[PDB]
Design an enzyme around this catalytic site. Structure first.
Site, short mmCIF file in Angstrom:
data_model
loop_
_atom_site.label_atom_id
_atom_site.label_comp_id
_atom_site.label_asym_id
_atom_site.label_seq_id
_atom_site.Cartn_x
_atom_site.Cartn_y
_atom_site.Cartn_z
N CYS A 166 0.84 -1.19 0.00
CA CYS A 166 0.00 0.00 0.00
C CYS A 166 0.88 1.24 0.00
O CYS A 166 2.06 1.19 0.35
CB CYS A 166 -0.95 0.02 1.21
SG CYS A 166 -0.11 0.06 2.81
N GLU A 226 -1.61 -9.55 3.77
CA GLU A 226 -1.12 -10.22 4.97
C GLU A 226 -2.20 -10.44 6.01
O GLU A 226 -2.05 -11.31 6.88
CB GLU A 226 0.04 -9.43 5.58
CG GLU A 226 -0.32 -8.03 6.06
CD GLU A 226 -0.23 -6.99 4.96
OE1 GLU A 226 -0.09 -7.38 3.78
OE2 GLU A 226 -0.30 -5.79 5.28
N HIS A 262 -4.07 -5.04 1.49
CA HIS A 262 -3.07 -5.72 2.31
C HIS A 262 -3.36 -7.21 2.33
O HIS A 262 -4.32 -7.65 2.98
CB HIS A 262 -3.06 -5.16 3.73
CG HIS A 262 -2.76 -3.69 3.80
ND1 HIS A 262 -3.63 -2.73 3.32
CD2 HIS A 262 -1.70 -3.02 4.29
CE1 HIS A 262 -3.11 -1.54 3.51
NE2 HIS A 262 -1.94 -1.68 4.10
#
Lengths: 562, 187, 562
Positions: A399, A528, A526
């Site tokens: 990002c 993750e 994101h």
């Protein structure tokens, strides 16, 4: 319903998130619903008005807003989801009391801290218990934890409230797990236990009784140290558990089983358990360690960030790389490179650490640049991104960093040196990246794209679409507020920079790719957060295979992990 | 592992195939050998047992005179040439070679000296340069720490090709405090 | 008169003796008399009824009795002596209160803790101040320290008593030096300072105010850490001193000068100072480090003790070897060998650490065996002593170990296997070492040889007599109670075991030597107490020179350090 309370201790930052989360994943596989309730004694909001990338992260994982980052350890090892009602802060409680005094709920009289505050905290515990996860019935055991150390002013109303909650129910319907730290300097040698004695004394000076003695150390102690804890803390000899510095984070459940403290919770709560082998499931934790500490190919991964070493602003990044490297047998080798030491000002000042960060980055075969903080270090990421597109080096932008990559493509390939985003310098002639807010129903002013947001694909044959199994509509969290101006995107159509990721209105660009490059994917969300040991994130698997040239053979077989 | 002496036997045999007689047996090795190796040279080379001298890889270049004195081969040249010598202490002067080693292998400040040359390592085109730095560092008690940096790996063509050894030569040069660039070869 | 108070901290055992002693040796060279007053909050006696060799030592250095071991750091760096009135324990105060109530001093009424116990402690401070050292006038600044941590029950009456002593005098006649510890685990990285914030809060919860912020760490911190504690502790920014793990013990005065905290004590106490160079003397501390961290010959010294690593029962031994190795340029290389792992039982059980301790001992060239603890490990020192006398290895026995060496000489050389001391097995036919107590004037029962005891030499040409300059009567401390039976000493006259050290009555044997051996001296007293950096102990100089074959050239020149 059972409740497990995990208070603070000597230190608050060594790794208390994985300690309380070990008891939740151990009883979840047996057939018991486990929920988590986070308590934040800080006055400021845990993630609402907190700094972006400085002393924490904006933990947004399946929630309409944002909560504390400590809730990540209670969702990776488990398989349930949480909401905004689990995280309770002191600032949020101060907002509802004012609304009750203005309307008229306390009979018009004044309120204090007891029994005016200890009873209000117990009401939020019943609201979360009656609202379980989507796909269950009613939780049986809860995991209650709080932040900070012990003895602070912000932690006094929490201990007094939890001391009365155990008296309303039965004796076997509440427990306590006190975690402490046993320091040991390298100039002393002998395990001088003194800070641990002061932590357990303050907890007993309120009305609670420690049940699970948790002591954090750095090496396995012998037997003469545990004999002193049995008389200083005035507890049982079998309640003292020895915890040292482990290798990773998944070795916590494997340590409590060898000490023999699993059956102590059964005799304390008087519950039933239908085990198969030995207490918890042995066909998941033991089999996971057989794919990491064996054969490794030693992959070099070098990323550029804000700090030269690991800190709290990169916690969710180092945990997602471990779950994606064990599937292809890789060793965790990550080096932190500061973005501020990559500009022309650093070379003219101290050139010692200037070429050192470039030496460890050129030898690697993977670039994973997250996001910066303001305009501090934006020129350093430009020099590191212009080389990955020329030396066939894989690059993946999480990002914010995508805004610095679209400008570089307009200067070297195109030729627009004046193009710059409106965040750094808004007074420009080529407004490439502007601020495009969203006006939802009921919201006023310029809001921020965060929460339940669904993205729509665009192109067909894409390297990122085949990782998810060729879908059509994917939902993912967001936090960015700046978007790409749809006016200057017509020039990129004649070049290799294609737009394979749009939104619902087809006016915002998120996922972009470059033609001709073997692996150059830049997104905005994101990946993750949507990862877990049972199924890692698809985007983080394409970066590992590209560093070892094992990506073309993953799509031909049909993607066994999609 | 075992000191298999075979190439040395062929070297001393070719010299005797002309009309000469080897007197001073000089053998270059890498570690101090014991006593079972010298017994084979006395019969393979057909020379005297005291003529074989053991020479290993020394630390520098001034330790050569200090090695032949310990083996006891200085007086062998006097009985071979039948000459006179007016010594003061023991054979040669001991107030110069022994005092020189007491200013180098003692206390050092660890000075970092990085130069740029043609090869990345030591070779024959930089022999007189590495010897002059040793004679100038012992006067102020310094340790020889020199790293060779190739001048061809400092241009823009090297960065666009193999940037691995590009920034490595700059990292060792910026930490130093001395530049001694000799001469190149053509363009 | 000024008074410097040094309270406890988070840990108790990191090295608080060398911290408070730095302020005493800095003002002593300027022309100010500095005294030390030790406060022990323990109920038991610090060294009277304490264990011999277990969790401490019997610190007897120029005193009629015995005091705490922490007084050693206040005498080596300085040049004054202390007495039994300096060390004050809680058990000693409870003995005089009963004597005053029985006679009639408190007007017959009962006593409590205030103002009945706070005034009694201030009276002992005036008695030590009016009785300085032998060769002075009146001390000006005192160093008051106490053991243990902060927050204990035994330390509460001491803080309350010291809080009122500063109000009786002026404001600039009292100070406070609070020491703390800053932990930093290897799994965190960031200096999360939290235990230090709780230590300074408990000290201010009585009435005291910290003036000298002393923080112990492990690495030099930056500037963002000092500014964070200044607002939490509510003190000055220049009062925070950074202390990390030093290389030795004499680097403490060299660290406080660079931070610039020496002139702060002058403006706080309003005193005068006649300096020559920069504050303290620079021709002693800087010149001492130029003889240790330069050229070293790497001497291997292997001793046999009770523990395999360093602990608190060998503190005075490791400090005396450092002061004797810098005179001949040597590096401290000491390895601890356990005496219990040298017997036949260890070889038949775990032979892993059996031959490991012998490998490091045979490679060395010096044996310095102290004393054991009871009959645990006595057979292990017999095998290590029989080899030092046959392989021309230097051996030096401090105390107690001489009893195990005289028996070995009677078994191998003579041939008396039945000979054994009365402490281990009294039922024997050859009572070699018996118990010979001393009956002084006024003392009843069997006393122990300890205090001001003077020994008399015997022979003339001895290697130990020439080290002191050939005297005739030397005084040294003692602690042993067992002596050699004067009946069986007639057989040793025909052998090489000569008796060159007797007492006053010529009935006790202390210093013995062996003929034919190059260096084999066995004594009974402790030479490590009568040592100092200005003049090391002669016995510890003959052991270092014997390990490098540089002892014969030390007597020919005339002994420049005798």
């Amino acid at each position: 319903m059972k409740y497990i309370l995990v208070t603070g201790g000597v230190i608050s930052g060594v790794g208390k998130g994985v300690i309380a989360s070990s008891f939740g994943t151990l009883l979840k596989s047996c057939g018991l619903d486990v929920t988590s309730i986070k308590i934040d004694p800080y006055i400021n909001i845990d993630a609402g008005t907190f700094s972006p990338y400085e002393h924490g992260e904006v933990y947004v994982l399946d929630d309409g807003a944002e909560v504390d980052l400590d809730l990540g350890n209670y969702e990776r090892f488990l398989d349930v989801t949480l909401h905004r009602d689990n995280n309770i802060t002191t600032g949020k409680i101060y907002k509802l009391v004012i609304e009750k005094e203005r309307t008229g709920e306390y009979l018009g009289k004044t309120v204090q801290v007891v029994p005016h505050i200890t009873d209000a905290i117990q009401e939020w515990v019943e609201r979360v218990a009656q609202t379980p996860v989507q796909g269950s019935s009613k939780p049986q055991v809860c995991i209650v934890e709080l932040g900070g150390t012990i003895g602070d002013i912000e932690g006094m109303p929490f201990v007094e409230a939890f001391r009365q909650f155990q008296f309303r129910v039965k004796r076997e319907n509440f427990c306590l797990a006190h975690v402490s730290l046993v320091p040991l300097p390298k100039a002393t040698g002998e395990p001088k236990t003194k800070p641990t004695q002061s932590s357990v004394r303050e907890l007993r000076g309120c009305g609670l009784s420690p049940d699970l003695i948790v002591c954090r150390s750095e090496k396995p102690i012998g037997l003469e140290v545990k004999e002193k804890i049995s008389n200083f803390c005035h507890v049982g000899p079998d309640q003292v558990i020895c915890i040292h510095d482990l290798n990773s984070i998944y070795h916590v459940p494997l340590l409590m089983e060898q000490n023999g403290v699993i059956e102590y919770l059964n005799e304390r709560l008087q519950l039933n358990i239908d085990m198969s082998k030995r207490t918890k499931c042995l066909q998941q934790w033991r089999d996971l360690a057989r794919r990491t500490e064996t054969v490794r190919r030693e992959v070099c991964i070098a990323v550029v960030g804000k700090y030269t070493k690991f800190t709290d602003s990169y916690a969710s990044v180092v945990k997602a790389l471990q779950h994606a490297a064990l599937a292809v047998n890789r060793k965790l080798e990550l080096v932190f490179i500061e973005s501020c030491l990559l500009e022309e000002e650093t070379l003219h000042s101290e050139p010692s650490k200037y070429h050192k960060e470039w030496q460890k980055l050129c030898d690697s075969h993977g670039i994973l640049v997250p996001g910066g903080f303001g305009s501090r270090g934006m020129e350093g990421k430009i020099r590191a991104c212009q080389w990955a597109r020329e030396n066939q080096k894989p690059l993946l932008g999480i990002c914010l960093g995508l805004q610095a990559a679209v400008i570089e493509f307009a200067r070297n390939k195109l030729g627009l040196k004046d193009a710059n985003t409106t965040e750094i310098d808004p007074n420009t002639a080529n407004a490439l990246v502007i601020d495009m807010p969203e006006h939802h129903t009921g919201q006023l002013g310029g809001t921020m794209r965060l929460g339940k947001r669904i993205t729509v694909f665009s192109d067909g044959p894409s390297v990122i679409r085949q990782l998810y199994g060729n879908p059509k509509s994917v939902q993912e969290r967001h936090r960015h507020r700046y978007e790409v101006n749809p006016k200057y995107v017509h020039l990129l159509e004649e070049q290799g920079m294609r737009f394979v990721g749009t939104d619902v209105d087809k006016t915002r660009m998120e996922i972009i790719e470059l033609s001709g490059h073997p692996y150059f994917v830049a997104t905005q969300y994101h990946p993750e957060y949507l990862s877990r040991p049972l199924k890692p994130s698809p985007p983080f698997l394409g970066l590992i295979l590209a560093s070892v040239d094992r990506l073309n053979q993953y799509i031909q077989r049909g993607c066994r992990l999609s």
